[PDB]
């Protein structure tokens, strides 16, 4: 009657509305049906502040040992959060700490649900975007000048052979701006690996965008290392399984994203992934329908969380005792996803089928007219909606019936 | 009775299929309703070759002098064309030479036709992407290194005052890639100016996008200069005209692009301009429906042309006698756009309304059914299309009734 989960699931608790909602998932939709070993780590801001953020390093190393992480959305501290919670220091983003201890690439996977319209009716399958987790603009040296002068870019070899000096330009009277940015071959290779691993697992084809027509050397390495990694360690499984890999120019790929139906993993350079991810998420109308999804190169370790944050605005409402309409879908799909990989490693098809059934019940509940406000308004103003508890209860029943 | 155009309209002839349609347009829709002095410059490949491209300089200085140009699509030489046409040398893009003589910014204006579907149905009004004409990735220095080493980026002021030496990074054992790029304050102010004059003359509010959360100095200048320029030169007028300017993050602007209805000018940095234009054009389905549209900073000079090329595959057909279904909408609109501004500078309202009437008459003509194959399959696997003269016959006729 309770399906036995074999290995552990690391559970990373979090903050505000998602913490409220995250417990109700665990108690109504996980814990009834599963006898399961949950390795718990409270990454709620209080408990990170109370351990000076060690709990986060612990949480990461636990994910790393056991291969599965399911995570509630968490507050990233800033000057306002420092005052609100009386933080001892401004603790760094926990995602950053986990990314960094785990390595691996973040993938944004949307959830398609027939009667919830996307802003591009053509879409029909999930468009997954994987975003190089390292480098380019996000590590840039950039600065301004209010005056004339010349700009030089030098590579100094570590073996002491001659510097390679590039004379870039002369900036005129009124000054301007200057920026230098880089990436690593190792990182680039590691980016392709996770990408192919992710596409293999989902059985989606894979695309790389670059702008190698303009940056021949810089983006040539993205193209070259993607093709090497594909050929050496991925091509035979791809072919193989009907799957494919291509490089396309970024200009083609953004048009393609708009035109195609979905069903592929688009690997983007760091900046492209930050931007495109926001085009695709907008398409689906609501972040309650978006997961992400850290997968390692190999791809043995997965960590899943809702792509949205902690829904402070809803939390302020719940705190007053007022009603809320918070979408639980991504959070649930974070859990279902973690369980998926867990039974994969386990290899206990029952945990997997439970994952999938849960998923289907959810899709089925909404394809019925039972939904939270963020979905309803996508449909129309005629469409009424469920408050957060109501929506989870609905799921819970529709799930009970099987 | 024919409408009297005051000043001269500089006309720039072009290539292949577009050259043909372009005469039909002149002869059927323009000359026979207007009393216009065309200062004519033939930019078909042959005459460019016969003048060693001087004609291109002459056309550009003509536009400078007279404030108005309308231009047929032209061939940009590469290796195949050098052979096809026996070119004496590989002449540079006449668009790039025009741009550089005139300065200014390129605006992509799509033509939104009620009965032609756009892949994003919520779009009821044109999204106008203005692209910075200069710098960033398009002038970068970029290289790969297959070894470890350090990267320094240095501004050496003309002064002889201390060079500012930034130590960017050490690249690990397997090497990596490095880029340096820049832009000029003087260029950035100009880009703001044409962006403002453009949005005012289209009666559209104006948005800029940057990523200044990450590139605080580099994009800091784009936002700061755009804002200065804005308050010091356009806010009075803008406010008076019921119009508004905002900076937004690129992540928000791509989201707004999909969800908003349209009806704004979107000033993108060079790269984001390159890319977002392709998302917008794909949404509209056909470059038959797209113009670009150079406006100078001040903004007394305008030069328009269709955003598509010379439509070679069609020409091959027309050379061989078979029928062609080439959309002249964007070209007619290049003419209508130019008359508008010629009408404006003069200032002679009958010119303007004519421009307007011809436009609405083209739209109305497609609204009644009757369209090139082009637009046809935006609509359905069967929607019946006219061939090139057949549809442009129809427009001649329709315009007639008024
Ligand atoms: N741990 C993580 O992965 C992330 C954490 N964050 C953090 O969360 C905090 C607050 O984030 P913020 O971006 O402001 O807000 P959210 O992304 O959490 O949500 C913003 C708005 O989007 C809507 N929304 C988001 N998710 C849902 C949902 N599941 N169901 C219904 N509506 C939803 C709501 O609309 P409306 O108000 O109109 O009802 C909400 O107010 C910050 O501290 C930030 O650091 C942010 C991103 C990721
Ligand atoms: N001066 C300028 O503004 C520009 C000039 N060019 C030049 O144009 C030349 C041809 O380039 P190329 O990109 O291959 O051809 P085009 O870019 O002009 O058009 C390519 C295809 O798009 C479709 N298409 C574009 N315009 C129309 C239209 N008005 N009506 C119907 N279909 C249309 C056709 O589809 P289908 O094949 O299915 O019929 C056509 O084959 C090149 O020499 C290039 O240098 C390119 C861009 C700009
Ligand atoms: Cl980084
Ligand atoms: Cl340039
Ligand atoms: Mn983003
Ligand atoms: Mn482009």
Curated annotation (Swiss-Prot), chains A, B:
The keyword Metal-binding applies. NADP(+) binds at residues 71, 74, 76, 81, 309-311, 314, 327. One of its GO terms (biological process) is glyoxylate cycle. Mn(2+) binds at residues 251, 274, 278. Binds 1 Mg(2+) or Mn(2+) ion per subunit. Its EC number is 1.1.1.42. Keywords: Glyoxylate bypass, Magnesium, Manganese, Metal-binding, NADP, Oxidoreductase, Tricarboxylic acid cycle. The record marks 138, 211 as: Critical for catalysis. It comes from the Bacteria. One of its GO terms (molecular function) is NAD binding. Pfam families: Iso_dh. Its cofactor is Mg(2+); Mn(2+). InterPro entries: IsoCit/isopropylmalate_DH_CS, Isocitrate_DH_NADP, IsoPropMal-DH-like_dom. It catalyses: D-threo-isocitrate + NADP(+) = 2-oxoglutarate + CO2 + NADPH. Homodimer. Belongs to the isocitrate and isopropylmalate dehydrogenases family. Catalyzes the oxidative decarboxylation of isocitrate to 2-oxoglutarate and carbon dioxide with the concomitant reduction of NADP(+). This is Isocitrate dehydrogenase [NADP] 1. It comes from Mycobacterium tuberculosis (strain CDC 1551 / Oshkosh). The gene is icd.
């Amino acid at each position: 009657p309770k399906i036995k989960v074999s290995g552990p699931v690391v559970e990373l608790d979090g903050d505000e509305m998602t913490r409220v909602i995250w417990k109700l998932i665990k108690d109504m939709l996980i814990l009834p049906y599963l006898d399961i070993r949950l390795d718990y780590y409270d990454l709620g801001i209080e408990h990170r502040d109370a351990t000076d953020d060690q709990v986060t390093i612990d949480a990461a190393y636990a994910i790393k040992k056991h291969g599965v992480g399911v995570k509630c959305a968490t507050i990233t501290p800033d000057e306002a959060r420092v005052e609100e919670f009386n933080l001892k220091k401004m603790w760094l983003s926990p995602n950053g700490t986990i990314r960094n201890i785990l390595g691996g690439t973040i993938f944004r996977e949307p959830i398609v649900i027939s009667n919830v319209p996307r802003l591009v009716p053509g879409w029909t399958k999930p468009i997954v975007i994987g975003r190089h987790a390292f480098g380019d603009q996000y590590r840039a040296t950039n600065f301004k000048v209010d005056q004339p002068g010349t700009v030089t870019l030098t590579f100094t070899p570590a073996d002491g052979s001659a510097p390679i000096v590039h004379e870039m330009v002369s900036i005129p009277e009124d000054g301007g701006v200057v920026l230098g940015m880089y990436n690593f071959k190792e990182s680039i290779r590691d980016f392709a690996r996770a990408s192919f691993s992710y596409g293999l697992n989902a059985k989606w084809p894979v695309y790389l965008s670059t702008k190698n027509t303009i940056l021949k050397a810089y983006d040539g390495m993205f193209k070259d290392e993607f093709e090497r990694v594909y050929e050496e360690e991925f091509k035979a499984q791809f072919e193989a399984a009907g799957l494919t890999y291509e490089h396309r120019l970024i200009d083609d790929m953004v048009a393609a994203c708009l035109k195609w139906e979905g069903g592929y993993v688009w690997a983007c350079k760091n900046y492209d992934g930050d931007v495109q991810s926001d085009t695709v998420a907008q398409g689906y109308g609501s972040l309650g329908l978006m997961t992400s999804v850290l997968m390692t190169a190999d791809g043995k370790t997965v960590e899943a969380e809702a792509a949205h944050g902690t829904v402070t605005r809803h939390y302020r409402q719940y705190q007053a005792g007022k009603p809320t309409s918070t979408n639980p879908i991504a959070s649930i799909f974070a859990w279902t996803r973690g369980l998926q990989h867990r039974g994969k490693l386990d290899g206990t098809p029952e945990v997997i089928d439970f994952a999938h059934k849960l998923e289907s019940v959810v899709i089925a509940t909404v394809e019925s007219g039972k939904m939270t406000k963020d979905l309803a308004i996508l449909i129309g103003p005629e469409q009424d909606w469920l408050n957060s508890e109501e929506f989870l209860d609905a799921i819970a029943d529709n799930l009970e019936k099987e």
